[PDB]
Design a protein around this ligand. Sequence first.
Ligand SMILES: [Zn+2]
Ligand SMILES: [Zn+2]
Lengths: 91, 36, 176, 97, 44, 134, 77, 112
Amino acid sequence: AKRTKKVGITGKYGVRYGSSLRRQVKKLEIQQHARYDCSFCGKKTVKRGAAGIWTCSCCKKTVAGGAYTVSTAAAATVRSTIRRLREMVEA
Amino acid sequence: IEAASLGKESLFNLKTAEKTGILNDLAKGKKRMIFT
Amino acid sequence: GAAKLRTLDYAERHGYIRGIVKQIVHDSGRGAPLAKVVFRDPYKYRLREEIFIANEGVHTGQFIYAGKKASLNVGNVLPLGSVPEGTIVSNVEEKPGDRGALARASGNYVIIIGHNPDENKTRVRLPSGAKKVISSDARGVIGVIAGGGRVDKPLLKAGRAFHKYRLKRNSWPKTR
Amino acid sequence: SINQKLALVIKSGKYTLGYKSTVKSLRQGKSKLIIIAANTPVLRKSELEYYAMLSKTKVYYFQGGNNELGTAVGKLFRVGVVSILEAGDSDILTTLA
Amino acid sequence: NKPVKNKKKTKYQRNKAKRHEEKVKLQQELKELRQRVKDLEEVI
Amino acid sequence: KFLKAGKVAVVVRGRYAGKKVVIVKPHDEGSKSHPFGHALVAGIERYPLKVTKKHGAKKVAKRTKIKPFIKVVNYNHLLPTRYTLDVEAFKSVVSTETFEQPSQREEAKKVVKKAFEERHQAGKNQWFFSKLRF
Amino acid sequence: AREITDIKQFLELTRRADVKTATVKINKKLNKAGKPFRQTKFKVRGSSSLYTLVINDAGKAKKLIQSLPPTLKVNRL
Amino acid sequence: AQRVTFRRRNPYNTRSNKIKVVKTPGGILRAQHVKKLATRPKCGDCGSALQGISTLRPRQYATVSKTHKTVSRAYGGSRCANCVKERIIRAFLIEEQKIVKKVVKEQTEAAK
RNA sequence: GAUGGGGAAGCUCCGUUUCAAAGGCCUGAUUUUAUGCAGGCCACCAUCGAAAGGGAAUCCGGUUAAGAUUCCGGAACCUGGAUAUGGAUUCUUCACGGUAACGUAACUGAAUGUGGAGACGUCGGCGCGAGCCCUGGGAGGAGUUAUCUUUUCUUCUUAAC
RNA sequence: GCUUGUGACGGCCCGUGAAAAUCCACAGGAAGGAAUAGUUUUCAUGCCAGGUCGUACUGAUAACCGCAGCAGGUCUCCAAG
RNA sequence: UCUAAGGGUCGGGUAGUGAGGGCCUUGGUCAGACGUAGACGGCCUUGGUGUCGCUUGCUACAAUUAACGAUCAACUUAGAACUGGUACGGACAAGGGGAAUCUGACUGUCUAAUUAAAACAUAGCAUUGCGAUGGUCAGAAAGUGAUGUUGACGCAAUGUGAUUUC
Ligand SMILES: [Zn+2]
Ligand SMILES: [Zn+2]
């Protein structure tokens, strides 16, 4: 079930560093150590190699992304706006 | 999707072959040129 | 190797030159990952490597187009005059020939405000918020520097600070 | 809708799922239409287009990746390319989509 | 061609097949020894 | 239905990968010896060297040499093209029974070699006699 | 050290131009828990390699010993 | 219970000073220095260990024959045959695109 | 850390590739001017600095008062060079086989371009191998035996290549 | 089981963990090469040669440093029941 | 002194047709050099160790009891009787524990030889400056050197030093 009520992945830090700091570290840590889907082959085979570098286990593609998650919201919106205004350049 | 689109421009294009007009001629292999 | 754009030449001034991304690698002391991009030397029959700063979305095996008439896609570098209103660039050249000076840190970019009639000038909003006018011939990579959100994670440990700052030139631990 | 006509074809006609089966069908001259995921590698896309041009077969690019195409066809696995061998009930062959 | 239809040889049957191959190869090597022995008279 | 005799394909697997062959006999059903859809094909192992105006007579004669080969090929190991090449000059020599005899392979290769050399000297099918750069 | 199997190759090798010395070695062994039998090793000394031929038949070994060249110098045991 | 020593003068457990223990015809244990293990050569495109190629230290390749170092195919000793197949297909389709695109360009500039 | 340069009254200093004429290579009856070298090709800067990093290749047995992977005996390997015989190949000149992964005793190659190896952090468990440890039978040697113990100890090994 | 080597994996990093000599291969094809005759020293065999300097012994409560032949200090390998 | 539990490897058939491998008990033809002896060996079996069998092709419950048997091996656990104690982790090895107050968040750090902290550092916290014709510094000044393989998620200086709550 649940070995830890609240602390979660932050259980390796014990009682140290303070509750608020452990909470702040928790979300980014969960993002970082997670396994993400691959946009190129469609498999959940993408893991971080270093902060910003994400590699797919299958299809062996390395992509650049966020420090602790594959994509950032800023990058997603920049991608979408580039698409939109280049379409309007065409039109 | 955009990576695939990036490749499409340089490699063989079925849409461009269809736009060329002659289709069955190309299927029979009527146009041939040598480069390099 | 330093992270610099391609040296300016006729191909990038008028048409486009196509390179391919070979690897996306980690640079010691730098937050942003680097991209190795191989181009064909227009004069000599030999391949030339370049070390760009990877933007978010750049991936191995991708085609990167550099020049005035290259597609407005993330990863492609363009003269600022070739891009429309409101675009977002990275590694922006301050002036033609410097090979990139603005918005090089992770998660940072430069927005385009508007162009100029009288000459080839463009104005831009820098990450801090300043509004600067550079030569419209200055190049930039489309997109945002990869590795964003890095500063959001607390270090939590003097040891993590030690490992971070031993690679930099900043003196650690600090005195005075 | 495109998903609805694909569902009708899957529930009524003949289809093959996968690159090797669709290439075999194109080689044997059995296919009518090939639906190709937007996520497919560009080399495979161009090769499939060349095969379909040689076999006089229509090519439609599905909007979405392997997961989307698989779940649209109605399977629980990712599907990259579908070949339509018979569309006796559905009218997907003639529609502009 | 016909479909795969799965199925499997287990462990014991594979052991017996390997044993038969070893016995056959042992006899083949004995025959090779006989061939090496025989030609001595002819060469002498 | 386009894999037939006379079609030109590109070998993509095997020792002759990257060469251009012409299909002399397609067995879509297969056979007992090759239980897969295959094709008897004839191709060029060594392309003739590209000559120019300057080259002398002996130089041209020695640079227009072609080494052919004959092989049974799985369909999955062919990249079929849109081009056609007249196979009638060796349909009789290139057959199923030829591949069972190393000497018959040799004679059939002689036939295919002289046919391809005649076509190249006549100037036909310069793409088929052109080498792929990959 | 190399083991040679063909008797024809062994004889051609013993007639080779660089070969001067050979050795005949006698071993007492058992065949499949059987009676104590004789094994004759012929070791021809080449420039690079010593070539060993193992014969398990005493009569064949004797006849080969007769078949050896005269100029070759043989060391027994 | 027999204890051994390094036989060269390097007294340190370095990467190039690794030993094994072997029993000799004299019935004693002895150290035997072992060379570094060889690495399989890798494909020039994908980086996978290409098969049919011997695994030797770099200087040792100068001693073996050609057959040990190559396979009988284009790019035999350098690429892994799936990369070769993709290279062939890409070259062919690049040529085909050139033909079609040139025809289209000529017709377009005719009708433009 | 020199040279090229530039400083400094000077002993010398700065800098490590530049603001240097920084050196190699191919062809020629360059068809006339009659005994004077012509036409071309390619780009980069010393050197030192590790007996623990990288790195060609040797093992066993024996031998001395004191030597030993170095001597002795036997058995190998590396590098460079000259070359001959066999094999292979060739009148389809520069090999055939295998659908394929690929195979083999070989199976020509200058410029030029490119790739691999060298060549790489730390921790955890899992699998496998080697030496050692423990142990059974049998063939030997030694100890114990006041009483008991088919017993206690020990030899039965195998290098590079 | 112990020591050690090794394989396929997993974890950690805002830390992602040398270079060069050197050897091989690929692409290319300047060329050269056979019929009462050629080629191939990346197959086998055969021939020749390998200079200079270190090499004994200790490595520590007797061989080094502390004015000593000091109850001190000084890197590392093997490791039985 | 017992009891219970925890494993490995091999095991499918005869009812049934007929051939295949090997010293083929005895019996049959061809037939091997050396020192009265003479093996091995180049050929065959319906037999043998209703005509056993070591082998494939197969009908016949192939096993829904292989839910069992033959064979091999290691040390762990749990429990129950009995039994001697002035003692049973018998030597060795090996935490004293608790209730309140002050202090520093912590891990860490320097005083080699009388001063190891309440001081230094630390992640976090806030402020301030800098877009290259720039900032911080070194330097009296410079064809001023570095930071700089640097570009605001950066560089640097300040002051407070975990975190929460009141
Ligand atoms: Zn992927
Ligand atoms: Zn590959």
